[PDB]
């Protein structure tokens, strides 16, 4: 069973019918073996006395009822006194004790030297004097104790002189609180408050510490600051024993009509370690700013902000945050404002990036970039759309070229379709206009000069085909179905000498099965590779009785009748193949069962003579607590040399490519425990590249967690060997898998 059912067994349940409304006017039912006195002035009940008055119940060996006619009061004061084995039970709290007193008019009840336990939730304790005031709103306890553990377990407890438990405020104010672990107290405070509910409340959060190897012992003591219903703020002083200073981590989540954001401004006033590493710097302060926003206003205006700005390149390799990893080459700084209706959308955005590298700090930025689409279907049998883009590229360095690019892409495609096929012709024009300035430096050094103004207009004709077959899989199970979807595209862009246009934003895109039929070799728009190809893929699926795709495989190839020339072919292929089936690419996905499930991929390339890239995975996932995943990612050294920069083909850290077997697992033990693993290996170098061993012990009143992680954390140029970094940390939280699996640098990514 889950822990929720385990804990509720020890929590008392309110089986009695719940009476709504005021219980003051409800009739009083008393059942006692003997009744002596002068009713209604004085009534004494002895022997198995049971009292009914709505939800409330009160049982005692002897009960005395006293009514006094208070002068000036229309209702006489009715007081109930209980002697011997007093057991007050209602729908909110259970009160036990030897002696009790009750005021029926004001619902005030007092119990001497007893123990309590509220119904429907965890919590208990014992107090010398227990009092209920304000219609059960205030549960005042004198010399009382409070703990959230179930009866019979003494993990932790709080003892205080005056415990006030405001049910409406969902707070448990404790006076002279002495927090105790078992019988041993550890923390004493004159005054303490506990949020015993779900209402958002300011005050310190529960601290969590961690020991690394970059900073030695660390400690987080967040102070949540509930500003308002739609804005909060956390202010965590983060301590680093090695760096000898506190870094102030300020968060600020908000929520408005424009969207729901999240700011952040970590800040270290001074750094001893950074002072040692760079003695020639004027100030050694380290700060991060992370602003992230995402909203839709009136279903037309879209605002996105994604902004990160660290002080120095070696920030993330030093301090670890949730807003960046040591595995980051650059920090992104993006704003965007959009206006999307049904048939139109103009989005003006800005993109600036901060490279963390000292090999080349030349970065390009779009400031601003305007993207305008405008669809207009049903132009007869055709469709249509016009894509326009204006963008201004400014470099960080002052010598590299700058440009202003305007683009217009008036598509028009005629779709045909039947029950079994669909051919989709599409013509398109690509009127790109440049204006490049600050060319003296680049033109002075290189041979192929850059023109100040460039026009580039190129037609693009495309003919997509497709057909679908079906078959009954009688040699599998009865009822299974199979398909076969042989697709076959033809594309044609003429050749335009694009060597006078600097490559501001164009990189080689990958070619899995889905990206074979794409009509762009380079992303972006500075390099539109001429093409004259035919693509042929075939996709087979296997449906079962309920028509649920249980399996699909795909293999496609491109056949270039003529080499894809941009006029600036600096790529470095292993051979001189130019026409013919240059690229192949597969893709599978087998859903073996409700729990298992396999995936795949491969992109053999004949110009490399070697399998370019190819992943995989075989995840078995019964639940978020019980899952075992394997995988594999490859990327041959030829691909690294022929796609990434020149020095990625020479550095020892980059030139081997990828070959990375890694297994993720997670499994409970004794239902109260848990273990989470991950271990990514780099089979080329036979060297680990990550790991983890998170362990959690969940219980009814507290759950402890102890992570660990040894990750690749940079490169040592002197010794030419990489540098690792442990990070064992301990978290406590009074009462967790998906926060362990997604912590390491290669976070778990579900494949089902």
């Amino acid at each position: 069973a889950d822990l929720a059912s385990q804990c509720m067994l020890g929590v008392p349940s309110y089986d009695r019918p719940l009476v709504q409304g005021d219980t003051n006017d409800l009739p009083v039912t008393i059942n006692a073996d003997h009744a002596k006195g002068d009713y209604p002035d004085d009534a004494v009940f002895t022997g198995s006395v049971d009292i009914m008055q709505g939800n409330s119940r009160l049982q005692a060996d002897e009960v005395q009822l006293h009514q006094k006619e208070a002068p000036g009061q229309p209702e006489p004061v009715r007081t109930v006194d209980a002697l011997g084995n007093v057991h007050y039970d209602d729908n909110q709290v259970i009160l036990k004790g030897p002696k009790g007193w009750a005021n029926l008019n004001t619902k005030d009840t007092n119990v001497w030297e007893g123990d309590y336990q509220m119904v429907g939730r965890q919590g208990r304790g014992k107090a010398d004097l227990m009092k209920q005031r304000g219609e059960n709103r205030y549960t005042i306890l004198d010399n009382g104790s409070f703990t959230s553990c179930l009866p019979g377990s003494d993990t932790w407890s709080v003892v205080g002189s005056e415990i006030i438990h405001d049910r409406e405020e969902q707070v448990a104010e404790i006076w002279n609180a002495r927090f105790k672990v078992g019988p041993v107290p550890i923390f004493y405070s004159p005054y303490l408050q506990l949020p015993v509910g779900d209402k958002r409340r300011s005050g310190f959060l529960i601290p969590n510490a961690k020991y690394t190897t970059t900073n030695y012992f660390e400690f987080y003591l967040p102070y949540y600051w509930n500003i308002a219903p739609n804005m909060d703020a956390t202010i965590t002083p983060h301590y680093m024993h090695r760096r000898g200073n506190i870094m102030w981590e300020n968060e600020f989540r908000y929520l408005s009509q424009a969207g729901a954001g999240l700011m952040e401004l970590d800040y270290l006033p001074s750094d001893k370690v950074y002072e040692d590493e760079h003695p020639n710097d004027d100030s050694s302060r380290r700060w991060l700013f992370y602003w992230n926003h995402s909203g839709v206003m009136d279903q037309v205006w879209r605002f996105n902000v994604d902004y990160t700005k660290v002080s120095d390149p070696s920030y993330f390799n030093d301090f670890d945050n949730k807003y960046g990893s040591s595995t980051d080459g650059y920090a992104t700084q993006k704003f965007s404002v959009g206006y999307a209706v049904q048939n139109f959308n103009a989005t003006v955005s800005t993109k600036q990036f901060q490279v963390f590298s000292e090999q080349n700090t030349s970065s390009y930025s779009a400031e601003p970039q305007l993207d305008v689409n405008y669809y207009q279907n049903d132009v007869g049998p055709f469709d249509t759309r016009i894509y326009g883009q204006a963008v201004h590229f400014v470099n960080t360095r002052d010598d590299m070229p700058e440009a202003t690019r305007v683009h217009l892409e008036p598509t028009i495609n005629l779709p045909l379709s039947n029950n079994w096929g669909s051919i989709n012709t599409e013509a398109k024009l690509l009127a790109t206009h440049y204006q490049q300035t600050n060319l003296d430096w680049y033109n002075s050094r290189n041979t192929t000069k850059l023109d100040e103004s460039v026009n580039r207009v190129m037609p693009q004709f495309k003919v997509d085909g497709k057909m679908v077959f079906e078959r009954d899989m009688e040699m599998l199970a009865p009822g299974y179905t199979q398909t076969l979807e042989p697709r076959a595209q033809y594309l044609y862009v003429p050749y335009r000498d694009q060597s006078d246009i600097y490559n501001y934003d164009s990189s080689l895109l990958q070619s899995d099965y889905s990206g074979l039929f794409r009509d762009r070799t380079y992303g972006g728009l500075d390099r539109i590779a001429s093409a004259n190809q035919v693509t042929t893929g075939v996709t087979s699926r296997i449906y079962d009785d309920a028509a649920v795709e249980r399996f699909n495989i795909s293999v496609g190839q491109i056949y270039y009748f003529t080499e894809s020339r941009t006029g600036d072919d600096n790529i470095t292929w292993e051979n001189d193949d130019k026409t013919g089936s240059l690229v192949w690419a597969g893709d599978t996905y087998w859903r073996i069962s409700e729990r298992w499930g396999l995936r795949g991929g491969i992109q053999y390339d004949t110009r490399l003579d070697n399998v370019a890239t190819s992943n995989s995975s075989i995840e078995y996932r019964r639940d978020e607590d019980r899952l075992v995943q394997l995988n594999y990612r490859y990327a041959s050294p030829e691909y690294i040399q022929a796609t990434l920069p020149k020095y990625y083909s020479t550095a020892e850290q980059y030139k081997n490519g990828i070959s990375q077997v890694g297994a993720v697992a997670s499994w409970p033990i004794a239902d109260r425990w848990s273990i989470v693993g991950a271990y990514y290996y780099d089979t080329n170098a036979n060297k680990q590249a990550d790991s983890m061993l998170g362990v959690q012990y969940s219980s009814c009143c507290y759950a402890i967690r102890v992570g660990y992680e040894r990750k690749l954390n940079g490169w040592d140029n002197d010794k030419q060997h990489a540098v690792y970094d442990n990070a064992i940390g301990f978290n406590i939280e009074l009462r967790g898998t998906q926060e362990m699996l997604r912590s390491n640098i290669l976070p778990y990514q579900n494949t089902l």
Binding site: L192, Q193, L194, P195, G197, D198, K199, R200, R201, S202, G203, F204, L205, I206, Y223, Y224, W225, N226, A228, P229, N230, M231, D232, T234, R253, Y254, L255, A260
Partner: peptide, 11 residues
């Protein structure tokens, strides 16, 4: 001690 929680629009 305090208590975090998902935000909501004010009443």
């Amino acid at each position: 001690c305090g208590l975090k929680g998902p935000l909501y629009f004010p009443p």
